[PDB]
Design a protein around this ligand. Structure first.
Ligand code: NA
Ligand code: NA
Length: 156
């Protein structure tokens, strides 16, 4: 029932959050976790995605689930982004791309005559026992948070 196996060490990686604290995936044991990776703070698309998740947060709560957004922007950038948009969930500053690589969301594109890496917008649903049970890759923003919520309700 796992669609992705993560390195065991992934669950103990210290994840720097907006607000200056740290978490790990293991610390979320016991409830559902949505982890949504996005390429960059404060862009039109990535802002829309975060606001879409933020608007549905009471429905996610009803399943006791929690949301984490992830990019490689700094904690300061995340703090600004969260404050300006009013997000009520944390953002991981995955500055070294450790979590991104664990979930295999760093993808290469041959453009400008060279190989360019970047975060591919992707989302994962992690069970209360830490299994990755559903994955969405190369995500288009429109309708995405709704679809993730629907899938959560179906799994939970
Ligand atoms: Na960190
Ligand atoms: Na979990």
């Amino acid at each position: 029932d796992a669609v992705l196996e993560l390195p065991a060490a992934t669950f103990d990686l210290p994840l720097s959050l907006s607000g200056g604290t740290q978490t790990t995936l293991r610390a979320h044991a016991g409830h559902w976790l949505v982890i949504y990776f996005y390429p960059k703070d404060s862009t039109p698309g990535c802002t829309t995605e975060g606001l879409d998740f933020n608007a549905l947060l009471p429905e996610f709560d009803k399943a006791g689930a929690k949301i984490l957004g992830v990019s490689r922007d700094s904690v300061k950038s995340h703090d600004n982004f969260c404050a300006k948009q009013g997000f009520a969930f944390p953002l991981v500053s995955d500055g070294d791309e450790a979590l991104c690589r664990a979930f295999d969301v760093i993808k290469e594109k041959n453009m400008y005559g060279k190989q360019v890496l970047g975060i591919e917008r992707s989302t994962f649903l992690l069970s209360p026992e830490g299994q990755v049970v559903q994955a969405w890759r190369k995500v288009k923003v429109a309708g995405h948070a709704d679809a993730v919520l629907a899938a959560l309700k179906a799994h939970a």
